[PDB]
Amino acid sequence: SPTQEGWDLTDKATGLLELNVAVNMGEPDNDFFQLRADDLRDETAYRRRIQSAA
Amino acid sequence: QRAYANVNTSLADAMAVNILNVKDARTNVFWADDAIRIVSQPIPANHELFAGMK
């Protein structure tokens, strides 16, 4: 806020100004992964890939 | 190893091999019941990886 000192302030009134900033999100950070129906008879590699990806 | 012998002698660089099927003929088949075995395995398409198919 500005400030002026004195008694008589005719026509010296100030305006209102408020600035702002912009925020945004970028691209997703993916992890693709593909398996056939063979590789889900054990599931341990699948689980470990999930945890390591996180 | 000689305990596992199943023939009285060995091949000797000259022995003629005689074919036994000399005429087209449908085959009668015999066996002992513990010879032919049918191994089976699951296709785990019930996994959560295969979502979108029933």
Swiss-Prot record, chain A:
The record marks 7 as: Involved in capsid stabilization and maturation. It is found in: Virion. Disulfide bonds: none annotated. Belongs to the P22 phage major capsid protein family. Self-assembles to form an icosahedral capsid with a T=7 symmetry. The insertion domain (I domain) plays an important role in the folding of the capsid protein by acting as an intramolecular chaperone. Interacts (via N-terminus) with the capsid assembly scaffolding protein (via C-terminus); capsid proteins and scaffolding proteins form building blocks that assemble to form the procapsid. Interacts with the portal protein. This is Major capsid protein. It comes from Salmonella phage P22 (Bacteriophage P22). The chain holds residues 55 to 108 of 430 of the full protein.
Curated annotation (Swiss-Prot), chain B:
It is found in: Virion. It comes from the Viruses. Interacts (via N-terminus) with the capsid assembly scaffolding protein (via C-terminus); capsid proteins and scaffolding proteins form building blocks that assemble to form the procapsid. Interacts with the portal protein. The insertion domain (I domain) plays an important role in the folding of the capsid protein by acting as an intramolecular chaperone. Self-assembles to form an icosahedral capsid with a T=7 symmetry. Belongs to the P22 phage major capsid protein family. This is Major capsid protein. It comes from Salmonella phage P22. The chain holds residues 324 to 377 of 430 of the full protein.
